[PDB]
Amino acid sequence: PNAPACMERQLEAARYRSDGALLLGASSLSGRCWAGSLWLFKDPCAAPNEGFCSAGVQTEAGVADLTWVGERGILVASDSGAVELWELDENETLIVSKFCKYEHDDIVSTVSVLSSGTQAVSGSKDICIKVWDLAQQVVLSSYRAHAAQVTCVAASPHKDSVFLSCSEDNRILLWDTRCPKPASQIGGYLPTSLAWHPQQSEVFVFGDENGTVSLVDTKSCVLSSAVHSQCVTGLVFSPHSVPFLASLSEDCSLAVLDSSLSELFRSQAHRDFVRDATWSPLNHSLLTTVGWDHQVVHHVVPT
Amino acid sequence: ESQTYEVFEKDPIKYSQYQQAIYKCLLDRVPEEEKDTNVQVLMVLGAGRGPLVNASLRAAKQADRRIKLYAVEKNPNAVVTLENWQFEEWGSQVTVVSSDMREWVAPEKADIIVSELLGSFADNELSPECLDGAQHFLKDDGVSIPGEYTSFLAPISSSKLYNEVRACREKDRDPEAQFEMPYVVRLHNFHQLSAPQPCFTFSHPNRDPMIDNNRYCTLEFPVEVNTVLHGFAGYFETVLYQDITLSIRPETHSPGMFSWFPILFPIKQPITVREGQTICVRFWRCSNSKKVWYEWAVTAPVCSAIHNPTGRSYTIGL
Amino acid sequence: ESQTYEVFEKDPIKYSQYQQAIYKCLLDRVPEEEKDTNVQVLMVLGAGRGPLVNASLRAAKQADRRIKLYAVEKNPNAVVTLENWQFEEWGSQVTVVSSDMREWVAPEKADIIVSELLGSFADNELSPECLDGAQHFLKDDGVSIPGEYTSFLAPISSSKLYNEVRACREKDRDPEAQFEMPYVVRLHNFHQLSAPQPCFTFSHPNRDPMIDNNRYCTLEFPVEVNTVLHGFAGYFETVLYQDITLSIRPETHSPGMFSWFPILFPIKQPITVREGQTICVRFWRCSNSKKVWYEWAVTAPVCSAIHNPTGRSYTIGL
Amino acid sequence: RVSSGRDLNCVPEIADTLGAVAKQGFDFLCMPVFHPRFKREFIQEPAKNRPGPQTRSDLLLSGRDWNTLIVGKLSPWIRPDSKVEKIRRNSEAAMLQELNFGAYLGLPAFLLPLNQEDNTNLARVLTNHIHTGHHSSMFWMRVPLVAPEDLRDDIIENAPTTHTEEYSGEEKTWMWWHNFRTLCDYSKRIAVALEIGADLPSNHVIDRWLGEPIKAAILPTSIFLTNKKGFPVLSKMHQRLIFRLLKLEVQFIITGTNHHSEKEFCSYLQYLEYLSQNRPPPNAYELFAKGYEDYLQSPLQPLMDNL
Ligand SMILES: Nc1nc2cc(CN3C(=O)c4cc(F)ccc4[C@]34CCN(Cc3ccc(F)cc3)C4=O)[nH]c2cc1F
Ligand SMILES: Nc1nc2cc(CN3C(=O)c4cc(F)ccc4[C@]34CCN(Cc3ccc(F)cc3)C4=O)[nH]c2cc1F
Ligand SMILES: CSC[C@H]1O[C@@H](n2cnc3c(N)ncnc32)[C@H](O)[C@@H]1O
Ligand SMILES: CSC[C@H]1O[C@@H](n2cnc3c(N)ncnc32)[C@H](O)[C@@H]1O
């Protein structure tokens, strides 16, 4: 279908867009060639079959993280130390490279798009965090705030200048590019994943390496719960008015939590690391997970 | 290491014999009328980087018979090579197993097991113990390749090699430990005092109740010259299937093959030997649950001390 | 040896505690109404010359409960003692088994297992490994005596003991091997620089999936005096059942008992320690399929070399 | 003239990568043996029973290529001194696996990081590997001149950078090294790969590394200034350091992306060559001495002995 013959084993990311087309990133973390790829599925249930895809392309290197940039654009965190932007064509069959700037000195491990949609922030294994402009295709600022590998960065949903970050230096940093000193440290185990609350601009949650999911307010007093037995890789809120939090880990399980961090759903469907989750915009009770076992499981969440 | 497997693979005569050995065994076990009905279950025990897997594929193609391959290998570094080959080249016909053959719980019994677990003294890599432990998942009418192997010994006079061993004395161990351990060596400046004689033999599959791999062998070597004994050169022969053999015994040496140099069992003190006298050597293969080792002693024309008692100086790890 | 078992048996306090431990466990497991219906299956794992068998008999009589005894013992020399006792005294109530507990295929599951596999550092006789291997023939609601044991460490200054270890240098091994191995010693002319702290703990029956007996423990010892560290004294505590305990930890030492002297982990080089400084020691329990050993290192106030890496100087045989 | 290599943490095709690196004049290539992000489980199911190959085949290069042109790297996720018991145990098994594979390939060197104070369990595992089998493979400990915490940008509002002169505190990275090599009992297989930062520390901090086994000097691309022509150069501070390092005859490694995008990547190396040629030449002393550097010889006794 005007795309690579075969995609890679380790599925790294999975995102839904407005209408409900499932974006897929995948990396080869084993074998001769260690590259990555991007895929589109207008039919979510056809995944991850390469013969039944809308779009697909082979990248130069592996895909560490990606995110939906509107409906056409795809932003990539590459191992080469480059942030890559791809754009779907008008037909939405091909995927042409928009830009591919090698600015990071090491693997780019996390990326997130800011409110405006013309800007994004990246985090690398090198300590730098960089602010990008997608229009001019240049780095606006470069910040060496942490003292270790930047694990996760997360843009504020409704604030352009604000974003979170976390690193192996055991620092959760709340940023604001308006301040002269933008970073601000939020007061045991290393932070691995971040997620802003969709309805509340002052609230966020973070998962650690020990498996604890936590609930933090900007003002202060925090709530938490031992959800997973191993490191929490990602945290994604549902599109509901009263949101459910989907948590995913390296213990090869999925858990859906309520507002009070209480376990609602459990799914030991994956046999390998669970890498990403994405709620279906059409059906809010559906949730799609991807893992290194090369499964694309669709979960019926009781809501 | 990788380059240790590399030099093994750079011996095409050995694998051509293995190819031919399997080729014949396929024809004997599977008739012409059951060509595409019967799929033979082969199991390469100790697959390494997979020269036998390949040979088994070639053997099946020239024979024109169906096979199902396993590739058991304990070394996890080599298993990386196997799986990359298996993904790219072989496919689902070869099932790479990353395990000890003595431990592995087989999901199927084998018609043939193929191994390459032989050193310069045949059983010095504990091929007996490994294949005994892998024997349970062989069919009651199953074949082993090799089906048999024997070790040979011959007394040698070499003032050079004696003086070479002497110089392997190391800090923080017995002063004479170097004399109580075998060496792999291309024997050049030496004198073979008597013709090689068989020492230890092993048959697979072993069907002797309470299988014991401990041994004790007395050899008498008629000497026809005055000389001074310094050690015993070791060789081996192996029967792969029937008339398919490998050998490093000088008189029956496989031509061109260079995958095994001879082994040398030294002695602490040189022993003078007059013409007409018989050199009498005694060789033990000993073991416990953890180790296997050899001991040896000269008993004629004069007695030596027993070498390597309790494997103090040299053991082979189980 | 016989006289090694003799001196073990010449400690009546230990066995009275074992007697009392079993006594209580019988009462808890068997109610009054099931006195002559329920026969408890006891299994002494490592029976020796049978002090526990006897204690188990006494415990059952004072409790007035029915028991069925096994006496598993691997040492065949001791089994001679057991069988002669069993024939003359015990009878068919005691079933003497001559086997390893890790190997033995039990014809019945146990309600209680009783063991005496503890050394001066508790787990230095590989009680964890043995009881893990004997765990399968324990009932799902079965008890182990001891049910738990812990090892303790305390830094010591002794220019005497340091100089004593020094003088254990032997031919034909590492010049500093003597410093990388523990010693059982009645510590007399020494100074305990800090209070003992717990090092390694073990619970039986172990219910942690994929049971791992490897460990790594960091201890910080606050020193309140100037001194020179020469090693670490080792002690242990064990919980037999509940409030029934044995201990050689000085502060909680069982009164009268003399069946375990303290153990000593030396260091190659003495380390000066000022008042107010913290001595930081690191202890590993390591293992492979054949051996178990300890490694250790001081990290504060100055670093020492890691002692006994890969069990080069000292191993405990499996 | 100068022996130089290339550090990469991204190798999509091992054969193609070398070709590019070799064309740019580099002598060897520092790269991972397992994919940096390929995190592996060894205890908990079902991730421990992950199928398929764990990394690349050894057949992709010749034995000689592995032996001379490749330097191994420990994967970044491996943290043997983690506070979490699970991550510790996993990192132990992973560290041995990677080190064993390094020895299998017969690599001449292997990089391990010293990026924190406590590297005790790291040292305990490495020492065990050294005393398992026999190998001549060196181990280059990646240690920075200045710790990452001490060269971070002062851009955190409620956590300002230490503006105090801490004489002992600025020497901390040496103490990281000292403790590590002491634990390992001065193994001759363990050497330093000294990572040079943007801002060089005080002179005393640099003098600390005199008499230490420095085998490599890692140079990031970020530390390079740009001249009027528009090509990479170094400061007069860094120039004096490189001049000192050339006397020790270390192997210079280049790490990081091409910040000088307009020019080739050879330009970085060409500058080190430029510095190599432009040094004070060896006098009659150093001409003759060249060969006997730190070579122990017994004092002559022409009375007792006849020369
Ligand atoms: N399982 C196997 N074991 C074995 C066991 C062997 C013999 N062997 C050693 O024991 C040994 C020990 C050493 F330190 C070094 C080399 C060897 C050899 C392997 C190769 N070689 C011949 C040679 C070497 C060098 C050469 F320039 C020409 C020829 C030996 O003498 N070859 C096997 C092949 C298998 F498949
Ligand atoms: N399984 C058992 N293990 C153990 C392990 C121990 C301690 N131990 C040694 O390790 C050891 C090593 C030696 F070379 C010599 C002696 C010991 C002892 C056993 C006796 N004794 C005390 C003592 C000795 C002499 C004395 F005049 C007074 C008192 C120890 O110190 N006692 C057990 C009893 C069990 F049932
Ligand atoms: C090709 S040389 C012989 C091969 O057999 C392997 N081997 C030796 N003993 C065993 C065993 N018990 N189980 C599995 N493989 C083994 C060795 O790792 C080597 O790769
Ligand atoms: C009474 S001292 C401990 C006793 O336990 C025995 N023992 C130790 N390990 C085992 C084992 N694995 N199986 C059986 N007996 C054992 C020893 O031989 C000793 O007599």
Coordinates of N, CA and C and ligand atoms in Angstrom, one line a residue, chain C residues 4-5 7-8 11 14-15 46 115-120 124-125 184-186 258-263, ligand 2:
Chain C
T4 N 32.6 -34.2 66.6 CA 32.1 -32.9 66.2 C 30.6 -32.9 66.5
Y5 N 29.9 -34.0 66.3 CA 28.5 -34.2 66.7 C 28.4 -34.3 68.2
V7 N 30.1 -32.7 70.6 CA 30.2 -31.4 71.2 C 28.9 -30.6 70.9
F8 N 28.3 -30.8 69.8 CA 27.0 -30.2 69.5 C 26.0 -30.7 70.5
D11 N 25.2 -29.5 74.4 CA 24.6 -28.2 74.7 C 23.1 -28.4 75.0
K14 N 20.2 -25.6 74.0 CA 19.7 -25.5 72.6 C 18.6 -26.4 72.3
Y15 N 18.7 -27.7 72.8 CA 17.7 -28.7 72.4 C 16.5 -28.6 73.3
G46 N 18.5 -33.3 58.5 CA 19.8 -33.2 59.1 C 19.8 -33.7 60.5
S115 N 15.0 -28.4 61.6 CA 16.4 -28.4 61.1 C 17.3 -27.8 62.1
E116 N 18.6 -28.1 61.9 CA 19.7 -27.6 62.8 C 20.8 -27.1 61.9
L117 N 20.5 -26.4 60.8 CA 21.5 -26.2 59.7 C 22.1 -24.8 59.8
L118 N 22.2 -24.3 61.0 CA 22.6 -22.9 61.2 C 24.0 -22.9 61.8
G119 N 24.9 -22.0 61.2 CA 26.2 -21.8 61.7 C 26.3 -20.5 62.5
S120 N 27.5 -19.9 62.6 CA 27.7 -18.8 63.5 C 27.2 -17.5 62.8
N124 N 25.5 -19.5 56.9 CA 26.9 -19.8 56.4 C 27.0 -21.3 56.1
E125 N 26.0 -22.1 56.5 CA 25.9 -23.5 56.2 C 24.9 -23.8 55.1
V184 N 35.7 -18.7 62.7 CA 35.0 -18.9 64.0 C 36.0 -18.7 65.1
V185 N 35.8 -17.8 66.0 CA 36.7 -17.4 67.0 C 36.0 -16.9 68.2
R186 N 36.4 -17.3 69.4 CA 36.0 -16.7 70.7 C 36.7 -15.4 70.8
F258 N 26.5 -22.6 74.4 CA 27.9 -22.5 73.9 C 28.1 -23.4 72.7
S259 N 27.2 -23.3 71.7 CA 27.2 -24.2 70.6 C 27.6 -23.4 69.3
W260 N 27.9 -22.1 69.5 CA 28.3 -21.2 68.4 C 29.2 -20.1 69.0
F261 N 30.5 -20.1 68.5 CA 31.3 -18.9 68.8 C 31.1 -17.9 67.7
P262 N 31.4 -16.6 67.9 CA 31.2 -15.6 66.9 C 32.1 -15.9 65.7
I263 N 31.7 -15.2 64.5 CA 32.5 -15.3 63.3 C 33.2 -14.0 63.1
Ligands
LIG2 N1 24.5 -27.4 62.2 C1 25.3 -26.9 63.1 N2 26.3 -26.0 62.7 C2 27.1 -25.5 63.7 C3 28.1 -24.6 63.6 C4 28.6 -24.4 64.9 C5 29.7 -23.5 65.3 N3 31.1 -24.0 65.2 C6 31.8 -23.8 64.1 O1 31.4 -23.3 63.1 C7 33.1 -24.4 64.4 C8 34.3 -24.5 63.6 C9 35.4 -25.1 64.2 F1 36.5 -25.3 63.4 C10 35.4 -25.6 65.5 C11 34.3 -25.5 66.2 C12 33.1 -24.9 65.7 C13 31.8 -24.6 66.3 C14 31.1 -25.9 66.9 C15 31.3 -25.8 68.4 N4 31.6 -24.4 68.7 C16 31.5 -23.8 70.0 C17 32.6 -24.2 70.9 C18 33.7 -24.8 70.5 C19 34.7 -25.3 71.3 C20 34.5 -25.0 72.7 F2 35.5 -25.4 73.5 C21 33.4 -24.4 73.2 C22 32.5 -24.0 72.3 C23 31.9 -23.7 67.6 O2 32.2 -22.5 67.5 N5 27.8 -25.1 65.7 C24 26.9 -25.8 65.1 C25 25.9 -26.7 65.5 C26 25.1 -27.2 64.5 F3 24.1 -28.1 64.8

